[PDB]
Symmetry: D2
Subunit: 295 residues, 4 copies
Amino acid sequence: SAVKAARYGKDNVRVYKVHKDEKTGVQTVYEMTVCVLLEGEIETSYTKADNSVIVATDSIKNTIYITAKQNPVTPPELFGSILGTHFIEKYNHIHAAHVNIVCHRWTRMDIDGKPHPHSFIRDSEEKRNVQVDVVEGKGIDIKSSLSGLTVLKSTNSQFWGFLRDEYTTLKETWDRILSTDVDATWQWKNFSGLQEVRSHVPKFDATWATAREVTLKTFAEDNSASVQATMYKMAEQILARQQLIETVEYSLPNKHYFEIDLSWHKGLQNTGKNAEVFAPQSDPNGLIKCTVGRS
Amino acid sequence: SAVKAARYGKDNVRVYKVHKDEKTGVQTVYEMTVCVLLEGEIETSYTKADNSVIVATDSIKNTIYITAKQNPVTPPELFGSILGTHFIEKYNHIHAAHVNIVCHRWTRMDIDGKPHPHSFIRDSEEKRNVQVDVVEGKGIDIKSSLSGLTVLKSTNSQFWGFLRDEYTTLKETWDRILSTDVDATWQWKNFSGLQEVRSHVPKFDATWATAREVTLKTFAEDNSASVQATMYKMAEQILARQQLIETVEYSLPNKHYFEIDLSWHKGLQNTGKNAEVFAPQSDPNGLIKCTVGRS
Amino acid sequence: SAVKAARYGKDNVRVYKVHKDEKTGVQTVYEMTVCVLLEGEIETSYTKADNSVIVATDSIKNTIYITAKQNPVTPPELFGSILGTHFIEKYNHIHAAHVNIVCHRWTRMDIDGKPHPHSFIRDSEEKRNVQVDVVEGKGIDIKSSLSGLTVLKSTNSQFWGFLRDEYTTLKETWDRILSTDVDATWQWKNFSGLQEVRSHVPKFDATWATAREVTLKTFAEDNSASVQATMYKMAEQILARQQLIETVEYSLPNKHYFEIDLSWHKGLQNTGKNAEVFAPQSDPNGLIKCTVGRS
Amino acid sequence: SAVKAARYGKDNVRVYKVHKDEKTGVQTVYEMTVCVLLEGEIETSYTKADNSVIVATDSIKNTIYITAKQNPVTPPELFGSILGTHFIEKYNHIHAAHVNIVCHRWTRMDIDGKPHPHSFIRDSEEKRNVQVDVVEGKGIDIKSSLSGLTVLKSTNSQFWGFLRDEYTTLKETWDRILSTDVDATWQWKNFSGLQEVRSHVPKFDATWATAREVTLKTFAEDNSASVQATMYKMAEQILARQQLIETVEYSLPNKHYFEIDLSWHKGLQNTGKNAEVFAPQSDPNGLIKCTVGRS
Ligand SMILES: O=c1[nH]c(=O)c2[nH]c(=O)[nH]c2[nH]1
Ligand SMILES: O=c1[nH]c(=O)c2[nH]c(=O)[nH]c2[nH]1
Ligand SMILES: O=c1[nH]c(=O)c2[nH]c(=O)[nH]c2[nH]1
Ligand SMILES: O=c1[nH]c(=O)c2[nH]c(=O)[nH]c2[nH]1
Ligand SMILES: [C-]#N
Ligand SMILES: [C-]#N
Ligand SMILES: [C-]#N
Ligand SMILES: [C-]#N
Ligand code: NA
Ligand code: NA
Ligand code: NA
Ligand code: NA
């Protein structure tokens, strides 16, 4: 036997950081969940019980807290780059660091129409994420994403003209509910290292904003011919508004809402144009994916 | 053996309803999860296989959809009352209906600063709930609640002066993080029946609003001496703003954020006034409960 | 305002304990999740910020570990009694302790047909639980339970003869799938205190065994007329095999498996006697409950 | 913009199938959750709203049930191959099918020491899975796995000799708890098509058995120097017992159990050799991965 691949590290590391403006008195909080997997010349840990090559995952944990203490944790793309760079620079035998981060929402509360200085709300379960790969000699590869963005439109969704054979029972429709949980990823041009990532720091928050904004507007205004069509239009626009993005990926479940025929009951009309009460279906669900790049 | 108690019904019934303004073109959506448990002279179903006394849970399901089709589903207190009343009025041998409803958020999207006519967002996992007990001869008992309201304040929380004995290691603190998931319940004066519930319909939405508003403001502004102290102040206020409420219940986890001593690392100062990076603790958690009524 | 009720404590306290037989070399492990809520003269903590009446939940946590260190953790009914008794005996102003415990499975592994001395498997997510209420002057009330016991039978289940009206669409059936997650609770005669609980210690494990055994056999052999009928028969038997039990409670979801009509496809016959492939339904589900006592 | 990649299908399709031995009267049940994603010439669905290229996910759902009706669903490797082959053979423009299957446990119950003919138990949440890729012109690639196999050993685990620097606080240990959730994958030699998969059908169940057996025995008997060392030994053995396997992948969380220093309490000794009560840590956790192939 031979080790073909190996990676190890710490997962599910919860981290909070507060910023306190000594002057204004305004505090700002950040919470994330961090995962770090390292690769390098560590194969002997697996084959001969050579733990000398192992940076203890406990130590990786410590390093996450220490890096958060010594550096900004925002934008996450930057923090992840700093953290990954640490490991490959610090340990000679460590040649790759993968850093995955989930950013949790702590939105500042408005009390009596006024933003509160130190009170926050988890206004949604929607996350902002980053996946950062720091590879010795190959720079820094960064994928940014939003996920758990749950939406529904009650009309202006359609699905007709799909293939029909002996396996097909679905009726064509020109008016349906469309609901999904948006998972959108934008993949950045390779960065040569931390300097290049730092030089672009403003664009991360700005591109996240754009991705969210375009997603919501496109979803809301597109008289959708299908999930496929609608999601391409989102990816289209995002690519046109940020040149440093190479690809845009969408993964969208179709969270079906079924009509309920109640005509059996006192001639109740609840289908078609009379459709009012629907049965949300927990499973199964359509799953539609696409990666859009530049022509 | 003898049956001491029995109840049966349908749980986890997902229901969507749309309202379409034919004139304005504005659509409004409602989604909930409904549970209905019936009691009455049904003991023979258990002891002698007498299914004649059973209103099939499948039929209860049907009835939920039909009631939603024929009546407003908002406010949930009303819908639940209508649904529970149906069962005890329709079936002679059914003497109690318990209706539990979870209301899911579908907040109308704002696109380009403008409210969209048919696109919505699950802006949080926070729920609005009702528990409605319709009992033959005893009227309608209603408990209303909000839950899954997740908050954090970064300062203006304290905990000192608690009992100290040989079991105590916790240090007193005059400055800590306080985070919780708010579960607040307001219990209504008994209602004689559906007429009385309908006569008060405006107060349900208004009292939910108040409960949420008071919860957030109290949390944000109280320089909390403890979870106990802070939650009583919330319950205090709500009781003073709606006379038809008899009690207010709070159940609040204390979602601990631990300081991290990094002094072992290059004399790093991250405790006390220098505390910046914290370890959110998933478990265990303090759990604090209280029911406040009128003196 | 006035406090009508109050309770506070620590929830989600994970605890592991190992027993090591110095002689045989056999180790035995126990894992549980503990929750402890206290009541007493603590109202001033809520109304006047008087923390002197508060036994810190952090301290309750400590006490859980210390009690586990100083006492057997099995059977859980005993451990919970010991723990609850501690709090009301130790603190003069604490008049009630509620202890909830979830026992997690660590079944000893059999390797090469031989029980291993220190290796275990979580052989199922099924739990054994206790709810123990230690009340000053009122003794010790104990409810024992098993939960998350997931079962299915593929035939020998029926449901016909239920009420039919204009709300009814379910077809009668003489052959269906029955699947559920068993939640069974047996409630013990009041105990005067710890001595009485200790005197009965063997009966706890024995009664849990019996409850499980009777549940599975009854489920498997009863040509069930309904969930109601079948569950009463379980409760019947358990009450007859342990006199110290006063009531038996069952809460059983009916986890529906729907037939799939495939006759639209090449005359495929998959209904009735030809039913082979079914659609498991995640929701909604029937929910059937009963408490059986002694005539 | 241009589509770089696209795939679509149905996820979370629950399927049950029963086998009824007309002679013996013995019934056997199978339950799984199926996911199917298709690739091919479907890009126009995304770019021009051309739904003619779309096999409706609703239809994919239908096809899953129909294939289960017409073919054995066991072993899952075979069923998945049959299902994937269907799609690329049936639809000219569909060039790849990915089929993911989760197999749920329904273990036959033993009643009074006797296997019951139609009653089953979900004896664990452990799953058996397959990932099957059917690619036109490139045959059938199959990855088989077991997951959710939760284990613990109370001793015979060690971790010393790891790197120590200014980031390191973990103490070396020669006696610790090791607990994990086993995710083991064995990747099969490419198959030319369905005939070749069918010719090997016995080896699938046999290789799953072996993988599980070797995992448990190695875990139980290895006086582990680390997770890394122990998992390689598992992968080593599996590769030596089934030549048609090319690689073996393990992904193992280290589910930490922390000692609890109780010496602050009445000199209580609960560390080192006196360690009895531990604090299971829900998060964070070490994560250790490796792919082992043939030298
Ligand atoms: O937008 C959709 N895309 C599909 O691929 C599909 N398949 C299906 O059944 N409904 C839908 N809807
Ligand atoms: O507000 C608090 N209340 C408590 O009862 C308690 N117990 C504890 O350890 N910390 C806290 N904090
Ligand atoms: O055993 C059953 N009990 C019910 O009360 C019921 N209701 C229903 O629709 N199916 C069933 N099955
Ligand atoms: O088996 C282990 N491997 C590691 O890589 C590691 N890291 C750590 O902190 N503890 C352990 N244990
Ligand atoms: C399916 N969309
Ligand atoms: C704990 N509060
Ligand atoms: C429904 N039982
Ligand atoms: C960490 N193992
Ligand atoms: Na390096
Ligand atoms: Na009645
Ligand atoms: Na007392
Ligand atoms: Na093809």
